[PDB]
Amino acid sequence: GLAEKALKALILQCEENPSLKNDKDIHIIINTGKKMGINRDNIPRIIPLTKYKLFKPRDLNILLITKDPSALYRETLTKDEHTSELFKEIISVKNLRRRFKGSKLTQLYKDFDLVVADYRVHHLLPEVLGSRFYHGSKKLPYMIRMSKEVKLKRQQMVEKCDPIYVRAQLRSICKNTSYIPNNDNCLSVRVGYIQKHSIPEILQNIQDTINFLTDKSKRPQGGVIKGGIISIFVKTSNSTSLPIYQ
RNA sequence: GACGGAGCCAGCGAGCCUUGGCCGAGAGGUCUUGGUAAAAACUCCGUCGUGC
RNA sequence: UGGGCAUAUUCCA
């Protein structure tokens, strides 16, 4: 087949070249026939994968930020045994600006691999979080909810942290992967990870990626592009653009 | 002596290198990626107690 | 009439 022959020599290409030996993420690059249309949401959006896990909250570090009072919410998730392990560190921004300003910032994505923040206080992350975090892997913080619905028409309503819900979408972001909308021709999605899958699991990851990505129901967040794709290339971090479809 | 919170006062001022796609003869643009580089003090509240 | 948070207002003097 077209794909799996190009994947075998890619996996052999991993274990022979030391520039490729140190980068374990696998991306795909999508040439679309025209440009996509919209840009600079700076928000990832998640695809529902239908077969197999990528990661789980046991295995990695999870980091949370909120608005004042953070002391009200930093106790609830650790006084429940379901969610006490599901995070590593929990603060607000107002500690975060004075804890790690500037030169310590290089050890941020060294010491972490997933960042999440409250939906209210997301719109100022790259200011205090720093420019150098962008955009080397294009890892970016995620947006979740702290409770159920709070409406805001004419009354000023308080909310309480519901831990089982945080557990519910927090388990939901680990099994899947996401993507970044932009206004260009090319589009990259990490879909593969070495020593954790087989080849046809990756084949179903790619065929599922075409399933959700070319959803013709014109749904918000579901099937954005139109007009059909040109080609799909595969590279890890420094390997060449090896095609599957042309 | 640590650790972690919460409290809170001022004055001098504006008064950097990479991987790859798409278009373009080209000049170049347009992006996706990896690494390296850049108030304090104090007040109180709770946990632990000496190694060159 | 003057300040605060949210970004047919609301609270305070």
PDB file of all heavy atoms in Angstrom, chain A residues 98-115:
ATOM      1  N   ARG A  98       4.097  36.939  39.286  1.00  0.00           N
ATOM      2  CA  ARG A  98       5.210  37.272  40.162  1.00  0.00           C
ATOM      3  C   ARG A  98       6.034  36.059  40.570  1.00  0.00           C
ATOM      4  O   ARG A  98       7.128  36.226  41.119  1.00  0.00           O
ATOM      5  CB  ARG A  98       4.693  38.028  41.395  1.00  0.00           C
ATOM      6  CG  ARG A  98       3.718  37.288  42.307  1.00  0.00           C
ATOM      7  CD  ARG A  98       4.405  36.751  43.563  1.00  0.00           C
ATOM      8  NE  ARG A  98       3.453  36.209  44.529  1.00  0.00           N
ATOM      9  CZ  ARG A  98       3.796  35.630  45.677  1.00  0.00           C
ATOM     10  NH1 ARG A  98       5.075  35.526  46.014  1.00  0.00           N
ATOM     11  NH2 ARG A  98       2.858  35.164  46.490  1.00  0.00           N
ATOM     12  N   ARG A  99       5.543  34.843  40.325  1.00  0.00           N
ATOM     13  CA  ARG A  99       6.362  33.662  40.583  1.00  0.00           C
ATOM     14  C   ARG A  99       7.488  33.528  39.565  1.00  0.00           C
ATOM     15  O   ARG A  99       8.668  33.511  39.929  1.00  0.00           O
ATOM     16  CB  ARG A  99       5.505  32.395  40.585  1.00  0.00           C
ATOM     17  CG  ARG A  99       4.674  32.151  41.826  1.00  0.00           C
ATOM     18  CD  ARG A  99       5.549  31.716  42.987  1.00  0.00           C
ATOM     19  NE  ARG A  99       4.757  31.317  44.149  1.00  0.00           N
ATOM     20  CZ  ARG A  99       5.272  30.928  45.312  1.00  0.00           C
ATOM     21  NH1 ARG A  99       6.585  30.884  45.475  1.00  0.00           N
ATOM     22  NH2 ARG A  99       4.475  30.580  46.314  1.00  0.00           N
ATOM     23  N   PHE A 100       7.147  33.436  38.283  1.00  0.00           N
ATOM     24  CA  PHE A 100       8.108  32.954  37.299  1.00  0.00           C
ATOM     25  C   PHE A 100       8.274  33.950  36.166  1.00  0.00           C
ATOM     26  O   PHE A 100       8.196  33.588  34.991  1.00  0.00           O
ATOM     27  CB  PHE A 100       7.682  31.604  36.737  1.00  0.00           C
ATOM     28  CG  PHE A 100       7.246  30.632  37.779  1.00  0.00           C
ATOM     29  CD1 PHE A 100       5.937  30.183  37.804  1.00  0.00           C
ATOM     30  CD2 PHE A 100       8.136  30.126  38.702  1.00  0.00           C
ATOM     31  CE1 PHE A 100       5.519  29.276  38.757  1.00  0.00           C
ATOM     32  CE2 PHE A 100       7.723  29.224  39.661  1.00  0.00           C
ATOM     33  CZ  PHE A 100       6.413  28.788  39.680  1.00  0.00           C
ATOM     34  N   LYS A 101       8.489  35.220  36.493  1.00  0.00           N
ATOM     35  CA  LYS A 101       8.631  36.233  35.458  1.00  0.00           C
ATOM     36  C   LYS A 101       9.957  36.077  34.722  1.00  0.00           C
ATOM     37  O   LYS A 101      11.026  36.073  35.338  1.00  0.00           O
ATOM     38  CB  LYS A 101       8.538  37.634  36.057  1.00  0.00           C
ATOM     39  CG  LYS A 101       8.554  38.743  35.007  1.00  0.00           C
ATOM     40  CD  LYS A 101       8.680  40.123  35.631  1.00  0.00           C
ATOM     41  CE  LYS A 101       7.413  40.553  36.337  1.00  0.00           C
ATOM     42  NZ  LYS A 101       7.538  41.932  36.891  1.00  0.00           N
ATOM     43  N   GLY A 102       9.878  35.930  33.402  1.00  0.00           N
ATOM     44  CA  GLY A 102      11.038  36.066  32.540  1.00  0.00           C
ATOM     45  C   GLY A 102      11.936  34.860  32.346  1.00  0.00           C
ATOM     46  O   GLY A 102      11.588  33.912  31.636  1.00  0.00           O
ATOM     47  N   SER A 103      13.108  34.900  32.985  1.00  0.00           N
ATOM     48  CA  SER A 103      14.209  34.024  32.599  1.00  0.00           C
ATOM     49  C   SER A 103      13.989  32.589  33.050  1.00  0.00           C
ATOM     50  O   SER A 103      14.641  31.675  32.535  1.00  0.00           O
ATOM     51  CB  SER A 103      15.517  34.561  33.171  1.00  0.00           C
ATOM     52  OG  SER A 103      15.792  35.853  32.661  1.00  0.00           O
ATOM     53  N   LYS A 104      13.076  32.366  33.986  1.00  0.00           N
ATOM     54  CA  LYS A 104      12.716  31.023  34.406  1.00  0.00           C
ATOM     55  C   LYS A 104      11.835  30.331  33.371  1.00  0.00           C
ATOM     56  O   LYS A 104      11.728  29.099  33.384  1.00  0.00           O
ATOM     57  CB  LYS A 104      12.032  31.099  35.782  1.00  0.00           C
ATOM     58  CG  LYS A 104      11.886  29.791  36.555  1.00  0.00           C
ATOM     59  CD  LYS A 104      10.540  29.140  36.337  1.00  0.00           C
ATOM     60  CE  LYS A 104      10.405  27.839  37.092  1.00  0.00           C
ATOM     61  NZ  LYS A 104       9.064  27.243  36.794  1.00  0.00           N
ATOM     62  N   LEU A 105      11.285  31.113  32.434  1.00  0.00           N
ATOM     63  CA  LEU A 105      10.227  30.673  31.528  1.00  0.00           C
ATOM     64  C   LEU A 105      10.655  29.514  30.638  1.00  0.00           C
ATOM     65  O   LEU A 105       9.811  28.710  30.228  1.00  0.00           O
ATOM     66  CB  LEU A 105       9.786  31.868  30.687  1.00  0.00           C
ATOM     67  CG  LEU A 105       8.512  31.914  29.854  1.00  0.00           C
ATOM     68  CD1 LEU A 105       8.123  33.365  29.801  1.00  0.00           C
ATOM     69  CD2 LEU A 105       8.696  31.377  28.445  1.00  0.00           C
ATOM     70  N   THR A 106      11.957  29.402  30.362  1.00  0.00           N
ATOM     71  CA  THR A 106      12.480  28.314  29.544  1.00  0.00           C
ATOM     72  C   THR A 106      12.280  26.958  30.203  1.00  0.00           C
ATOM     73  O   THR A 106      12.139  25.944  29.511  1.00  0.00           O
ATOM     74  CB  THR A 106      13.965  28.537  29.269  1.00  0.00           C
ATOM     75  OG1 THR A 106      14.682  28.521  30.507  1.00  0.00           O
ATOM     76  CG2 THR A 106      14.178  29.874  28.593  1.00  0.00           C
ATOM     77  N   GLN A 107      12.238  26.918  31.527  1.00  0.00           N
ATOM     78  CA  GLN A 107      11.962  25.686  32.239  1.00  0.00           C
ATOM     79  C   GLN A 107      10.478  25.413  32.382  1.00  0.00           C
ATOM     80  O   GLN A 107      10.103  24.486  33.101  1.00  0.00           O
ATOM     81  CB  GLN A 107      12.614  25.721  33.617  1.00  0.00           C
ATOM     82  CG  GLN A 107      14.122  25.811  33.565  1.00  0.00           C
ATOM     83  CD  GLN A 107      14.755  24.578  32.956  1.00  0.00           C
ATOM     84  OE1 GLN A 107      14.299  23.457  33.180  1.00  0.00           O
ATOM     85  NE2 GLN A 107      15.814  24.778  32.185  1.00  0.00           N
ATOM     86  N   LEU A 108       9.622  26.195  31.726  1.00  0.00           N
ATOM     87  CA  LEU A 108       8.192  25.930  31.825  1.00  0.00           C
ATOM     88  C   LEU A 108       7.804  24.696  31.020  1.00  0.00           C
ATOM     89  O   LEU A 108       7.368  23.690  31.591  1.00  0.00           O
ATOM     90  CB  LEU A 108       7.389  27.158  31.401  1.00  0.00           C
ATOM     91  CG  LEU A 108       6.896  28.010  32.579  1.00  0.00           C
ATOM     92  CD1 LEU A 108       5.890  27.204  33.384  1.00  0.00           C
ATOM     93  CD2 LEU A 108       7.996  28.494  33.508  1.00  0.00           C
ATOM     94  N   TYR A 109       7.999  24.724  29.698  1.00  0.00           N
ATOM     95  CA  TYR A 109       7.629  23.540  28.928  1.00  0.00           C
ATOM     96  C   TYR A 109       8.640  22.414  29.070  1.00  0.00           C
ATOM     97  O   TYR A 109       8.380  21.307  28.589  1.00  0.00           O
ATOM     98  CB  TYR A 109       7.403  23.874  27.446  1.00  0.00           C
ATOM     99  CG  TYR A 109       8.599  24.286  26.616  1.00  0.00           C
ATOM    100  CD1 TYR A 109       9.277  23.356  25.836  1.00  0.00           C
ATOM    101  CD2 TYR A 109       9.000  25.614  26.547  1.00  0.00           C
ATOM    102  CE1 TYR A 109      10.353  23.724  25.050  1.00  0.00           C
ATOM    103  CE2 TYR A 109      10.076  25.996  25.758  1.00  0.00           C
ATOM    104  CZ  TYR A 109      10.748  25.044  25.014  1.00  0.00           C
ATOM    105  OH  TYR A 109      11.818  25.412  24.231  1.00  0.00           O
ATOM    106  N   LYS A 110       9.773  22.666  29.722  1.00  0.00           N
ATOM    107  CA  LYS A 110      10.595  21.576  30.225  1.00  0.00           C
ATOM    108  C   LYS A 110       9.894  20.824  31.348  1.00  0.00           C
ATOM    109  O   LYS A 110       9.925  19.591  31.392  1.00  0.00           O
ATOM    110  CB  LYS A 110      11.944  22.114  30.705  1.00  0.00           C
ATOM    111  CG  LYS A 110      12.898  22.607  29.618  1.00  0.00           C
ATOM    112  CD  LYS A 110      13.651  21.456  28.936  1.00  0.00           C
ATOM    113  CE  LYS A 110      13.043  21.021  27.609  1.00  0.00           C
ATOM    114  NZ  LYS A 110      13.860  19.959  26.972  1.00  0.00           N
ATOM    115  N   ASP A 111       9.248  21.546  32.259  1.00  0.00           N
ATOM    116  CA  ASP A 111       8.692  20.918  33.448  1.00  0.00           C
ATOM    117  C   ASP A 111       7.219  20.579  33.305  1.00  0.00           C
ATOM    118  O   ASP A 111       6.611  20.092  34.264  1.00  0.00           O
ATOM    119  CB  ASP A 111       8.892  21.825  34.663  1.00  0.00           C
ATOM    120  CG  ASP A 111      10.354  22.011  35.013  1.00  0.00           C
ATOM    121  OD1 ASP A 111      11.154  21.099  34.714  1.00  0.00           O
ATOM    122  OD2 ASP A 111      10.701  23.064  35.587  1.00  0.00           O
ATOM    123  N   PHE A 112       6.624  20.833  32.145  1.00  0.00           N
ATOM    124  CA  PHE A 112       5.212  20.564  31.939  1.00  0.00           C
ATOM    125  C   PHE A 112       4.987  20.089  30.516  1.00  0.00           C
ATOM    126  O   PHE A 112       5.819  20.283  29.627  1.00  0.00           O
ATOM    127  CB  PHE A 112       4.353  21.801  32.220  1.00  0.00           C
ATOM    128  CG  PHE A 112       4.275  22.165  33.665  1.00  0.00           C
ATOM    129  CD1 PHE A 112       5.105  23.138  34.195  1.00  0.00           C
ATOM    130  CD2 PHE A 112       3.374  21.526  34.495  1.00  0.00           C
ATOM    131  CE1 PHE A 112       5.033  23.471  35.529  1.00  0.00           C
ATOM    132  CE2 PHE A 112       3.293  21.856  35.827  1.00  0.00           C
ATOM    133  CZ  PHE A 112       4.125  22.827  36.348  1.00  0.00           C
ATOM    134  N   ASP A 113       3.844  19.452  30.317  1.00  0.00           N
ATOM    135  CA  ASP A 113       3.428  19.013  28.999  1.00  0.00           C
ATOM    136  C   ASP A 113       1.958  19.266  28.711  1.00  0.00           C
ATOM    137  O   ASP A 113       1.526  19.022  27.580  1.00  0.00           O
ATOM    138  CB  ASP A 113       3.749  17.530  28.830  1.00  0.00           C
ATOM    139  CG  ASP A 113       3.242  16.703  29.975  1.00  0.00           C
ATOM    140  OD1 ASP A 113       2.761  17.276  30.967  1.00  0.00           O
ATOM    141  OD2 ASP A 113       3.337  15.469  29.902  1.00  0.00           O
ATOM    142  N   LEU A 114       1.183  19.761  29.675  1.00  0.00           N
ATOM    143  CA  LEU A 114      -0.190  20.163  29.402  1.00  0.00           C
ATOM    144  C   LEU A 114      -0.580  21.274  30.361  1.00  0.00           C
ATOM    145  O   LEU A 114      -0.329  21.185  31.566  1.00  0.00           O
ATOM    146  CB  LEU A 114      -1.159  18.977  29.502  1.00  0.00           C
ATOM    147  CG  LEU A 114      -2.570  19.124  28.912  1.00  0.00           C
ATOM    148  CD1 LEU A 114      -3.600  19.791  29.834  1.00  0.00           C
ATOM    149  CD2 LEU A 114      -2.478  19.895  27.593  1.00  0.00           C
ATOM    150  N   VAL A 115      -1.212  22.305  29.812  1.00  0.00           N
ATOM    151  CA  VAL A 115      -1.633  23.491  30.543  1.00  0.00           C
ATOM    152  C   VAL A 115      -3.106  23.718  30.236  1.00  0.00           C
ATOM    153  O   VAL A 115      -3.526  23.598  29.081  1.00  0.00           O
ATOM    154  CB  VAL A 115      -0.783  24.716  30.151  1.00  0.00           C
ATOM    155  CG1 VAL A 115      -1.276  25.971  30.837  1.00  0.00           C
ATOM    156  CG2 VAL A 115       0.680  24.491  30.494  1.00  0.00           C
TER     157      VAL A 115
END
